[PDB]
Symmetry: D2
């Protein structure tokens, strides 16, 4: 039919336009942002670069299909292939962390790690029961609808005070004891948490926001040997898309485990709509890489690049909280240098160096504004080895040296850009 043929040309002329054709203004901004990422140093601990395959999935046709529900029993029919993808993504999630499907289940639908945590609480608690997690020195949604009693690192050392923690948890008796989160540069002592959770009758939950990739690479201690629930992000050290994961115990107890029905129903229909199918397939791709040998090398390099950068700052008499790092991030007290995190943040940005401020403690226990947080995963994905992270520490210290005027920035920005533009940007050129 000639009418049907001209109908196809109308669809294609709309459906098949590129960004530069369809929205010149958005394309201009998206190109300026590609240059910004290529021409700067990315030291924000929670940033990374996704590969092209992850990007192809993110920008694919699976979003056209609505898939409310969980695989196998879907609200909408026509999900044969979306179901395969999500099951494969579930299987790969269990495999990346060496989990057995008879002891662990996994939900890959949370829109983010925050939603995933909130989903755990909603599934396991009545509104107003007691949770107890780590706070940085009614804001969060968890503390609006639940009673939350955050614990704190020892101001004097930067490390968690586990004895005070056991006292608090025993006194308060939360239903969920949460470890993980914020920006803690050392290893969590999962045995002591398990011991504490056992004594006070709480479920033990690990939020692996910042370190899921290290755990997968067997380069951080394994929470799954000790926790009952583990949630994670998918975009940080894992290098997948935005999103979150909920892992939970299954089967008989050391009466069965309760989590699976409650958590699934809490994700949908309670708190979310349909899943972001494009994100789920992208995560399948990232989770298949998280289990590769190549990815284990990357994570080892992340850990080694963070150490090399820490050491270079230590050799310039910088005060780092806990004195270093076990993982990929480090917290730098700028108060000795007479600087605040806010001021330093803005000077670094003037030099194509992105860091972010964080609240820290002074030795005496007062909250200081002079904290900055940095990390290695992003520039490690761009190819940087240890010599380059030492150079970057030199940029960082020089920026601080400048900000102690509280002109010469042009030199630093020129040097940072000359430096950064030497390294590939994944999925582009």
């Amino acid at each position: 039919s000639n009418a049907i043929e001209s109908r196809r040309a109308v669809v294609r002329a709309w459906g098949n336009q590129s960004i530069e054709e369809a929205d010149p203004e958005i394309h201009e901004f998206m190109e300026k942002e590609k240059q910004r990422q290529f021409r700067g140093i990315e030291l924000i601990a929670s940033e990374n670069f996704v590969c092209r395959a992850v990007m192809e999935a993110l920008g694919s046709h699976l979003t056209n299909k609505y898939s409310e529900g969980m695989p196998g029993a879907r609200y909408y029919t026509g999900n044969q292939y979306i179901d395969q993808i999500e099951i494969l993504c579930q299987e790969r999630a269990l495999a990346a962390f060496g989990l057995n499907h008879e002891k662990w289940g996994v939900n890959v639908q949370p829109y983010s790690c925050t939603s995933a945590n909130f989903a755990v609480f909603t599934g396991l608690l009545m509104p107003g029961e007691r949770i107890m997690g780590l706070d940085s020195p009614k804001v969060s949604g968890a503390s609006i609808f639940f009673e939350s009693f955050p614990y704190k690192v020892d101001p004097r050392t930067g490390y968690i005070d586990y004895d005070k923690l056991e006292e608090k948890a025993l006194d308060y008796r939360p239903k969920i004891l949460i470890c993980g989160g914020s920006s803690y540069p050392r290893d969590w002592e999962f045995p002591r948490f398990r011991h504490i959770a056992d004594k006070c009758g709480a479920v033990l939950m690990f939020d692996m926001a910042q370190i899921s990739g290290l755990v997968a690479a067997k380069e951080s201690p394994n929470p799954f040997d000790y926790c009952d629930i583990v949630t994670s992000t998918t975009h940080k050290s894992l290098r997948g898309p935005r999103g979150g994961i909920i892992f939970y115990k299954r089967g008989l107890k050391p009466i069965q485990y309760d989590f699976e029905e409650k958590i699934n129903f809490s994700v949908f229909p309670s708190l979310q709509g349909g899943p972001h199918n494009n994100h789920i397939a992208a995560l399948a791709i990232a989770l298949k890489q998280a289990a590769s040998p190549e990815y284990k090398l990357y994570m080892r390099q992340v850990k080694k690049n963070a150490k090399a950068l820490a050491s270079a700052l230590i050799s310039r008499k910088c005060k780092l909280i806990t004195g270093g790092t076990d993982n990929h991030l480090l917290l730098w007290d700028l108060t000795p240098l007479g600087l605040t995190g806010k001021v330093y943040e803005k000077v670094c940005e003037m030099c194509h160096i992105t860091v972010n401020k964080v609240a820290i403690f002074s030795e005496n226990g007062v909250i200081s504004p002079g904290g900055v947080r940095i990390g290695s995963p992003a520039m490690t994905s761009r190819g940087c080895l240890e010599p380059e992270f030492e150079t970057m520490a030199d940029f960082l210290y020089r920026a601080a040296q400048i900000a102690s005027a509280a002109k010469e920035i042009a030199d630093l920005r020129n040097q940072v850009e000359a430096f950064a533009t030497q390294f590939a940007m994944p999925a582009f050129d």
Copy 2:
């Protein structure tokens, strides 16, 4: 440096792989799903096809940047270009609906319409205050943390009973009166809601889940002349990515309006993490199209394709709830034909026809399982005009005729596939 050059080839060999190279198994499933969409009839009222530009944004590099916060005051530095994009997206959102920035504000960060509704409640209510929305004939997250008292359509007619509604709202006095949602095939009488909300002291909220595109095209009544809050999806009639929007009143009242601080803080940091930057730029692209003249033609055709399909079913003595539709969807009572929605759902799927079941009322007021819901936006984007929606009604009725055996399916599937494969699939060939 030769070392730095080989470092670039390592990054590129990982960063620049395609799906078919990097994950053959996921690529197989994603290709089977492209064929499924191309070779079938998509009649689920909430599905649509995104264009390539939207897809290019969805699969772009903006996700590498973390952008916690709202534009202008960001937690992380380095968001100059992401801020531009989100502001442009905010401006375009106001423009698509003819809103003035001095009377309306907009947040484009909700991960979905559900999150966006939940965000409104969290920002405006204490846990446990009274909301009152429309229900289909403690499940939802809103009813877990808030006291919710759903109202119902008149079982006898399918239409909302506004007099009973005014009585209920006056008796119960909710803090928020919500219209919109589920799968209501007629126009909402915003004047009566405003009248009812005024009498009982509630804020008036419209959830335009299903009809945001019609509203934008000035082809459905305008909620913004009457509501105080309007939330919407972004992937259904709008043809953007997944996501939600919150619009809210600003400035002086007919003491200023309160919504802006509360709703923004509820989206972040309370309930969400950082925004899905790729989704926001994709939405900017879709919102710039939603305001075009071409898009107004598309929506007019959606409305006309839904009517043509309704009429063709009416001429075969099908019972449709309210007897037709004002918009893009229609609800079909299959009980006369001696069928349930579940059974019919599975037979259609055997013929590459996707519909979804919904609960409906019988005339006497008992809940019937024989409801099915269908809609026109998806196949309208593939180019279908009214003659093709009449053909599709013929497929639908024949499928029902078959399912009254409660063999000849091969003929129907063959005919549906021969039919569907005549129409372009946006962004592909």
Copy 3:
């Protein structure tokens, strides 16, 4: 010992003083009030006159023993005889209402009927769950801690609309459906409440504040044939001391009944301290009286006196809500006469007539302030028969005639006093 002997004189010198000796000022005020009760007409439906036995119990030595707990299981020792009194009082309560101890249990410790109702809610419900009771045309403690959705009488008739109530209860699904309370001048239809409670899954509670003596005397329908929980006052028509009672079902269901442990534990130790031993023994005396033939004659006179007062107002063309009464109280609309309840209230008081105002409806549906409530138990305990209640109707009407003029109050007060002093006052001379 001389020492020990003189120590007795000191104790007696303090312990054995009369009120007039020890507190002349309080004695003066208490004599003024005794005169006021004797020289006045007491027409407040809630008031009555306790006998000397009740007063001797209220003013006895049982208060000296602290008795936290329930009988047979008390916190303290020394309760051998207090236990027997509370047991006897429990047994007499069951007997007064014809109840069998292995289908009904009873707790006589509540400090007041309000406490008793709140104790039931605390025991049976989680904080924030739904109750539904009658309201007069946040305030109550029940509505602060639970979600209350009150129902109302039909404004046009004064009677409850059981069809609107069944609708509301099915829509709202309360966990407790309460009847009784306020000042309903007619019989509750317990069979309809039982049917409504059954359809929506609620516990059926009757608060028999006003009519508990009428029920005891078999002059009002028996709530225990239908309810699951029955609370009551003890000082109104029962003529006992201040306090409340909780009756609850026991044993097998037509799994055992839940209430006993939950309700007792809510009374003590959750909401109350030790019981008022003086009040429990007083109640034992009143409950023994309530089961006797003489009390049945008193309640019959109470009904006949209220009926005679009503008919006398009716012949003066007064408008009474529902047009009369089934029990001991009536509601009178003073709007036609051009008076407010509060204006008429204070005029009556000048004439030694105590009544109290109440909110009522007008025939349309607006709240009228011209309601007054009166009832017969107090003056029936003073000996008045039907002729004396017709005299009192004449006083009431003449008082209203005076207040429509807004002096000759003096004449009406003197007539009320000459009238009221004709009648004995229980327990004095």
Copy 4:
């Protein structure tokens, strides 16, 4: 009239019967209890002996008038004289504790100290907000409807650890910080509580259940110098009737004070019905006595009798918690003697000695069941001086010697009786 005359005989025949006439069975039980109090040693710290004036008020005609509301603003009319009594009682309460009416207000309606505490919470706090008080080593109504985080004494010493308490309060940030309650044998340090309350932003409440007479007599530190709210019982050391009191700050702050309207409205109509008029007049009598020189001598003897009983146990090598007492009560650890509190409890009862068991700590930190609590107000009101409290220590110890053998109980009971009957019983002969 002959009719009217015979009607008086009927009323008098019922109204004027004695308990012995009207209820022989209750009279028998009440005489048995009068003997039991007279022939026993009452060492329960909570008990006391009301005088005849208090009993005549408790057994008077004021109960016949219903009096919902606060004085000067009552629901009903006819309250001219009841108002003056409650005013007088309010004034005497302020006077007994040296308070000025334009810095402190008082509500004398609470049915019990427990009711009074709960009324304060309901008035000052939203449901689900945080209180923090002392617990003995969900249960209480406060913890069902609010979030309670109890603090505890230092197990090793019996004293409160004010440094751990300041830490807890800063961590938990309660809205009300409560001191007082349970059975603390030592002085509360109000200055530290005020400092803790200030640092964490809480209202400071003192529940003076046990020591309200000592405070009135100036024999215990004055809580009103530091607290914002003070509740109290009325029947323990005050020797009044059962009931409670709420004192609250008024007027300008060192914006006005919030408590008055919130607290009064919580008492009535939220949580209670009308007040117990007989109890309010009784309290007026007790409060007048409490401000008199004679009462100050009684409380001094109460302190000296408790001190003499303690020293006698101490010389028998008993272990008392904190080693003694500042007030009227002491706690005794029976673990060294090899006894449980409950075993010793029931033995004492066989010898006409009333004590009650309590939970205590061992020196390590485990809960011991071997606690017993005793105190001096009851037998001091019967006339005992220090020598008689030393005799009583000998009874107590000899009782414990018997129970370590787990007969010669008979000898000890007969000695207790011969001893106890030496002493007068207030208000009888």
